[PDB]
Design a protein around this ligand. Structure first.
Ligand SMILES: Cc1cc2nc3c(=O)[nH]c(=O)nc-3n(C[C@H](O)[C@H](O)[C@H](O)COP(=O)(O)O)c2cc1C
Ligand SMILES: Cc1cc2nc3c(=O)[nH]c(=O)nc-3n(C[C@H](O)[C@H](O)[C@H](O)COP(=O)(O)O)c2cc1C
Ligand SMILES: [Cl-]
Ligand SMILES: [Cl-]
Lengths: 248, 248
């Protein structure tokens, strides 16, 4: 069907026209996001739509100079949100902050926000729009919270750049099915692991050779390890706790 | 748009027929899940397809006796996976074990797994199948990791029950748009908060009154307050660290 074709056709779009999203398109994207399943009906997230040129610019800089954060149809910031729940309880004369600060609630809010974001992404892609997630905002969350004026119990997780593509780019191959999908138990067989990872590394190296006309030939395992041990964002261990999450 | 109609039509399905998913349907669902965006191309997740009757039964018990975990077309378990990355590093003489233990990588893997799960959910719903996320497996993760034989740096997050619906249930109203969506900065205005929460509380109380015919009239505030005061899964603060996540 058309939905599965749209899902499988996905690629990140990093080049957009200057055509802004309409209020109707933004409305549809937000409603689509909200329609996602939510743990215990908590809906533990918020979406900040950034259209202010100065704020889009600041976020682009904080994200590591990503121009598709400024130049797009709209920039959405997905947040883990337990502030709604804190304030909801204060209205009833209750002061429940300690209950919102454990690892369980941090997992709940991150998963809720991510399911909503992926619904927005599929909805945007079905309309012929392009998307790109922006985790780069996590380089400087203290400054991002100042740009967005987010209160305590609110954690920006990533942005989502949405717009009319100026360049369609191309699809990136995913891990072989047998690396990701396991039947009944997790497959720890070393021979199986080496065979799948060798095959994938060759697929990726060939992909870069083809895409760059021989200019790049890196494997997936070399690429992922190179970037993992770079800007590790260790400050988040304490910073998330400062915002009221994942404590103890 | 058909995709958007499917997204907006979502409701959790908790009653399935005994018709199992075909190998082709499972293949399509897995490929759909893999097609989601992934932070730095890391694909930090694994999907365990549980078809073994004894394992589906154990997981339904561990999830708090949820029969739709056992009786469905297939039961998928979504895991945060940094074991793939640890093993790739080991086979190259690199050491990233400490970085895979930080908050940043825990967020990366939780988000990657959730985006994949929501792609699978939309793909399943577009085929006329029903889905239900199962976070209940987090009640006893030590026993869940034994059922699934997951190694270190692998964390089961939630299950996803997929199948042919035996009962279509009904939609649950979501928060008003103004409660979740903010323009440029987070809206902390108390009057705005009270007005939106009062409106939602009435929508929800009216919803339950119609759904149960006057026998249930709780507001969304009542329901969140009672959820918050529940038996907390506090053990996860230490348990996730035991699996090599969020050690910090
Ligand atoms: C991560 C996650 C975990 C969930 N875990 C469970 C569960 O264990 N049992 C269950 O019956 N529903 C579960 N749900 C379903 C939610 O209860 C449901 O999405 C919420 O009540 C909104 O209802 P709706 O999906 O029908 O719109 C979960 C949803 C999410 C997103
Ligand atoms: C949570 C998240 C954060 C991301 N952050 C960024 C980012 O800051 N900049 C960027 O250019 N791409 C970003 N991406 C896009 C990934 O790089 C991209 O999804 C991966 O390379 C696979 O490529 P594809 O999306 O084109 O299939 C992110 C993706 C996710 C899921
Ligand atoms: Cl990132
Ligand atoms: Cl749950």
């Amino acid at each position: 069907n058309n939905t599965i074709e749209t899902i499988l056709n996905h690629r990140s779009i990093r080049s957009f026209t200057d055509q802004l999203l309409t209020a109707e398109e933004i409305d549809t994207l937000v409603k689509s996001a909200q329609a996602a399943s939510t743990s215990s009906y908590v809906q533990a997230y918020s979406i900040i739509g950034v259209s202010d040129p100065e704020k889009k610019r600041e976020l682009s800089v904080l994200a590591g100079n990503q121009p598709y954060v400024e130049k797009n149809g709209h920039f959405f910031v997905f947040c883990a949100d337990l502030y709604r729940h804190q304030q909801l309880a204060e209205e009833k004369g209750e002061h429940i902050s300690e209950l919102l600060e454990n690892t369980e609630m941090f997992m709940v809010s991150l998963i809720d926000a991510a399911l909503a974001a992926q619904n927005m992404s599929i909805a945007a892609e079905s309309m012929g729009l392009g998307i790109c997630y922006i985790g780069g905002i996590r380089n400087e969350l203290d400054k991002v919270t100042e740009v967005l004026q987010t209160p305590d119990h609110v954690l920006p997780l990533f942005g989502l750049a949405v717009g009319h593509p100026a360049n369609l780019s191309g699809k990136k191959p995913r891990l072989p099915k047998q690396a990701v999908y396991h039947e009944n138990t997790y497959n720890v067989n070393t021979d199986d692991f080496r065979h799948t990872m060798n095959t994938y590394d060759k697929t990726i190296s060939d992909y870069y050779r083809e895409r760059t006309n021989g200019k790049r030939e890196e494997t997936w395992s070399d690429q992922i390890l190179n970037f993992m041990k770079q800007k590790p964002r260790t400050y988040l261990n304490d910073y998330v706790k400062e915002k009221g999450f994942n404590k103890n």
